[PDB]
Amino acid sequence: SQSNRELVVDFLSYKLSQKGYSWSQTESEAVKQALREAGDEFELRYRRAFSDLTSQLHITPGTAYQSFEQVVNELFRDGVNWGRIVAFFSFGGALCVESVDKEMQVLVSRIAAWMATYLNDHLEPWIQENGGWDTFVELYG
Numbered sequence: 001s002q003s004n005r006e007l008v009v010d011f012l013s014y015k016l017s018q019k020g021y022s023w024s025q026t027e028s029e030a031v032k033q034a035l036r037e038a039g040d041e042f043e044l045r046y047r048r049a050f051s052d053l054t055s056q057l058h059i060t061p062g063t064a065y066q067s068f069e070q071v072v073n074e075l076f077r078d079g080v081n082w083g084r085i086v087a088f089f090s091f092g093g094a095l096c097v098e099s100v101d102k103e104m105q106v107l108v109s110r111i112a113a114w115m116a117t118y119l120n121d122h123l124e125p126w127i128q129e130n131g132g133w134d135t136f137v138e139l140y141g
């Protein structure tokens with residue numbers, strides 16, 4: 001839904017404010033706060049245990065959605081758990097952060113459309129199948 005939309009933005013803008021950048025190119029906030037937190041732990045703790053997915057996608061302004069998708073597919077080669085969804089978000093942040101690093105901040109809005117597309121096309125059936133976002137929270141919060 002658009003629940004996923006505003007979630008991609010929260011995660012992205014946070015990841016940028018953290019790197020010193022600026023996105024300007026209730027119980028809900030609890031999910032955002034929870035995803036903000038898990039991504040931070042993901043980065044501190046695991047990110048460097050897996051192959052670098054950003055190394056596999058050579059991000060450019062003329063990169064297509066299906067390029068991104070086919071890379072993101074790799075993440076979920078062995079199924080969907082919440083962790084990999086976290087890693088997914090972390091990935092979008094790193095694409096975003098790298099983009100701004102390389103003077104391609106135009107991509108950022110694209111990367112967010114991309115993730116949102118990927119979420120609804122690939123992951124929402126799972127999330128609702130596994131208790132929605134309020135469930136992710138009860139576990140990882």
Ligand SMILES: O=C(O)c1nc(-c2ccc3c(c2)/C(=N/Nc2nc4ccccc4s2)CCC3)sc1CCCCc1ccccc1
Binds near residue numbers: 047050051074094140
């Ligand atoms: O749980 C898993 O099975 C799992 N498999 C994972 C997996 C499976 C397959 C692949 C990978 C990871 C790969 N990851 N490569 C990445 N490279 C990058 C680069 C930048 C940002 C994010 C990423 S993720 C590359 C090869 C395919 S990631 C993952 C979750 C790791 C823990 C997440 C977490 C951390 C703190 C709090 C809550 C949850």
